[PDB]
Amino acid sequence: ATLRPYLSAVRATLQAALCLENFSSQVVERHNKPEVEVRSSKELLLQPVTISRNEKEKVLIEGSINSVRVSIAVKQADEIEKILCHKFMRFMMMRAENFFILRRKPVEGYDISFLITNFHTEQMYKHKLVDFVIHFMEEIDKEISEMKLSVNARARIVAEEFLKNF
């Protein structure tokens, strides 16, 4: 009941933030850096905003003239979900070079972070990135649940196989 309203607020905020352009560095001769990362020019940074579904689930969106950082607090109901989520996010971050919009590490306080730059919005349809982020949030919850059901299902079969042989 609170899912759709949450994702809708996040999607709209992402459209507002993903309005980037190429920006040569102002501080370093012939450099080109994601301003939201280096933050060496305050006027190039936008106001950080947060969209929260509850005390646990939320999304932090940090914009700047040429890049946006997106951090997500994934839902983790119990311990098995917590460790599965951590292993899954770690798994994807290790492959960040292939998943080119992912940060190698989340922003402190979040489980996974994206760094979308102007080069990305230049090479991909920005409305499709927004779609991807929303799609991502929904799909990780689903995968985590399936993983949870799997570990439980295999555990039952493993306990029986051993017990039934005595």
Partner 1 sequence: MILLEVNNRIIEETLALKFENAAAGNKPEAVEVTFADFDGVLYHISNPNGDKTKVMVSISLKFYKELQAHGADELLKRVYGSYLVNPESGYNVSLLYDLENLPASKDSIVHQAGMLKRNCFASVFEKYFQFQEEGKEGENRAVIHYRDDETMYVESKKDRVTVVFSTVFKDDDDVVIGKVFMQEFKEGRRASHTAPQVLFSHREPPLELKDTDAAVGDNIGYITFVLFPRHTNASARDNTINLIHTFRDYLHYHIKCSKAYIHTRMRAKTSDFLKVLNRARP
Partner 2 sequence: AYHSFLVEPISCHAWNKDRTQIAICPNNHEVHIYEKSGNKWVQVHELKEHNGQVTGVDWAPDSNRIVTCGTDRNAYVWTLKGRTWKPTLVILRINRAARCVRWAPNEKKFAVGSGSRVISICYFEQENDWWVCKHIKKPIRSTVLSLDWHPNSVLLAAGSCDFKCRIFSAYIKEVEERPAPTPWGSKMPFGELMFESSSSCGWVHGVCFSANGSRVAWVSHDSTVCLADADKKMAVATLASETLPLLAVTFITESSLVAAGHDCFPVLFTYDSAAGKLSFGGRLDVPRGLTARERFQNLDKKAAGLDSLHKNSVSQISVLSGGKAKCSQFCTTGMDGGMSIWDVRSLESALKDLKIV
Partner 3 sequence: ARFRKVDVDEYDENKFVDAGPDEGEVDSCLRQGNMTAALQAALKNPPINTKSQAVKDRAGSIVLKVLISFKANDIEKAVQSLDKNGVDLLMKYIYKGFESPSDNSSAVLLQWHEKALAAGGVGSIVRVLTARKTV
Contact status: 107 vs partner 1 (CB under 8 A): no
| Part in contact with partner 1 (CB under 8 A); list of ranges 5-13, 18-26, 28-36, 80-88 | 80-88
The residue among 44 and 130 lying less far from partner 1, judged by its C-beta, is 130
Shortest distance, CB of residue 40 to partner 2, whole angstroms?
Answer: 12
Shortest distance, CB of residue 125 to partner 2, whole angstroms?
Answer: 5
Shortest distance, CB of residue 78 to partner 1, whole angstroms?
Answer: 9
Out of 22, 32, 40, 150, which residue is the one contacting partner 1 (CB under 8 A)? 150
Hunting for tokens 């051993």 — which residue is that? 162
Q: Which residues bind partner 3 (CB under 8 A)?
A: 1-2, 5-6, 8-9, 12-13, 15-17, 19, 27, 40-43, 46-47, 49-55, 58, 63
> Distance between terminal CA atoms of the chain?
48
